[PDB]
């Protein structure tokens, strides 16, 4: 029952964490929460079915009604950017939604675009490495800041390694 309370208040605060950074929905979520805080019966484990299941009976539907506006922002996920970088920024913006396999549908839709855009960037890195350190402008700049060719080469290589990972 306490595991349920854990997931409950964690999901609750994560909902607040996303909706606040995304008037109309705050009051809605709070009405659902306050009626749910009363239907929990102050931890009636013997009525865990009653309290928790009823809490989910109301809370699920009302918070999925909040998921409708969140779904409008799910459309906005592509509707905002053109590269997987900014799309990934807004992907990280919704850390609460990784527990809900409903966002995963549009995620599966943009899995194509995300993976191809990331492939674009990684092949761009391939092009950069293929134009190795003695050729690239990193040679002149690294030598200007007094870095040996060994050092400049290996530093540049590890930076591309870090960007790859």
């Amino acid at each position: 029952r306490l595991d349920q309370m854990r997931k409950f208040r964690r999901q609750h605060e994560q909902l607040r964490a996303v909706i606040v950074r995304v008037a109309n929905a705050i009051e809605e979520v709070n009405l659902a929460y306050e009626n749910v805080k009363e239907v929990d019966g102050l931890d009636v484990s013997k009525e865990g079915t009653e309290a928790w299941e009823a809490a989910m009976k109301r809370y699920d539907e009302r918070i999925d009604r909040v998921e409708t506006r969140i779904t409008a922002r799910l459309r906005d996920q592509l509707g905002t950017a053109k590269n997987a970088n900014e799309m990934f920024r807004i992907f990280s913006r919704f850390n609460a939604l990784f527990v809900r396999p409903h966002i995963r549908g549009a995620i599966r839709e943009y899995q194509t675009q995300l993976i191809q855009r990331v492939k674009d960037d990684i092949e761009s890195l391939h092009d950069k490495f293929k134009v190795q350190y003695p050729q690239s402008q990193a040679c002149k700049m690294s030598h200007v800041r007094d870095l040996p060719p060994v050092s400049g080469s290996i530093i540049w290589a590890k930076q591309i390694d870090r960007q790859l990972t």
């Binding site: 409708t68 779904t71 409008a72 906005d76 592509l78 549908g105 549009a106 599966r108 839709e109």
Partner: protein
């Protein structure tokens, strides 16, 4: 003063926009002037383009309300005429002439509007060929035509609508076999998400005049050719024609769900004005005919719920009768079960984008439109909730 070079300038394509503005401004000067319970707004009857032209569907325009694509299927009487005709009509000026004519090359079926584009019209056909109709030019011929390949648009699309707003506008073309192909509002080269739906068995599910439940999510009801209504999507693996709503008695021809909840309850319900002739109400999570209406005379084909009042509807018959029902107010009786001109099988009934107006797609050509000031958005949420509840109880006792 001669007209040699003048008529040859007329022969040139220099006057495309000039003839378009000539049509528009002479139609602005159409209503000649001098200086010294259904309201029945206006019947839409073009002279050449609307005669032996069976209406396909009545799609409404988001931008510039009081406009509908008078989509006409090419009837058997006009094979030599351009297969598929679509028309726009200024519903305010009271003009017996359409504002702009847009025929096609494939038999138009559920032609829609290029959303956020008054200078463009785009919609599906019998071949599933969503063709582009440019309004800036007088080219009534489709300037861009959708491919007709195997995995591409092949079957008659009776639902070619975007998902939500222009944000993630997925103009998914839902065909009579399930070949769901998404699109945008303007690109017409290759569909956005070319794919296909799957049924429990024999995937050829001839969808017919479907809708979306209130919320307007990618979940679309199915106007299946055999009853036992289904719901599916196109996005991801949700493209399964499997949520059977058994209890119907015929091919679902007219099916329109609950519109945007404004004066009634949510109630994700859809009525089925189909071949059972006794129009059945159904919720999106019912699997039972929530409420069977009056046994209509003949083949029923269309229904639509008003965007103003999202609970009432307007079902039809096969003998030309518009049975517009009130639901939160009455249960066994409709409001004004009027009889449309003559006794044909009513093809289309689609409420105006502004609401409270019934556009009855007539037999061939003409479009009798019944205006109403009675099917208003009455604030009855608990009444409609209890209506769908009690009939959601009576559906299976």
């Amino acid at each position: 003063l001669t007209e040699e070079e003048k008529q040859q300038i007329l022969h040139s394509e220099e006057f495309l926009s000039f003839f378009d503005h000539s049509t528009r401004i002479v139609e602005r000067a159409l209503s000649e002037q001098i200086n010294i319970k259904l309201s029945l707004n206006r019947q839409f009857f073009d002279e050449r383009w609307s005669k032996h032209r069976v209406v396909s569907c009545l799609d409404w325009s988001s931008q510039y309300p009081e406009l509908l694509v008078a989509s006409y299927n090419n009837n058997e009487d006009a094979p030599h005429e351009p297969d598929g005709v679509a028309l726009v009509w200024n519903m305010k000026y009271k003009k017996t002439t359409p504002e702009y004519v847009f025929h096609c090359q494939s038999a138009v079926m559920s032609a829609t509007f290029a959303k956020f584009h008054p200078n463009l019209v785009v919609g599906g056909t019998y071949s599933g060929q969503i063709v582009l109709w440019d309004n800036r030019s007088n080219k009534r011929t489709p300037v861009q035509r959708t491919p007709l390949s195997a995995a591409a648009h092949t079957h008659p699309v009776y639902c070619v609508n975007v998902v939500g707003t222009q944000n993630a506008h997925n103009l998914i073309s839902i065909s009579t076999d399930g070949k769901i192909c998404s699109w945008s509002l303007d690109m017409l080269s290759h569909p956005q998400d070319s794919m296909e739906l799957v049924h429990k068995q024999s995937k050829a599910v001839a969808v017919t005049s479907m809708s979306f439940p209130v919320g307007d999510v990618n979940n679309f009801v199915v106007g299946s050719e055999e009853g036992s209504v289904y719901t599916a999507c196109r996005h991801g693996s949700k493209a399964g024609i499997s949520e059977m709503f058994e209890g119907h008695q015929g091919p679902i021809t007219g099916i329109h769900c609950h519109a945007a909840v404004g004066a009634v309850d949510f109630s994700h319900l859809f009525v089925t004005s189909s071949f059972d002739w006794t129009v059945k109400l159904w919720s999106t999570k019912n699997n039972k005919p929530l409420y069977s209406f009056e046994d209509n005379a003949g083949y029923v084909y269309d229904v639509m719920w008003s965007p103003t009042h999202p609970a009432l509807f307007a079902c039809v018959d096969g003998m030309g009768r518009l049975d517009l029902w009130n639901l939160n107010n009455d249960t066994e009786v409709p409001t004004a079960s009027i009889s449309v001109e003559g006794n044909p099988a009513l093809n289309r009934v689609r409420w105006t984008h502004s609401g409270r107006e019934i556009a009855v797609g007539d037999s061939e050509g003409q479009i009798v439109i019944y205006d109403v000031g009675e099917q208003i958005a009455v604030p009855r949420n608990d009444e409609w909730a209890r209506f769908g509840r009690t009939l959601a109880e009576i559906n299976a006792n």
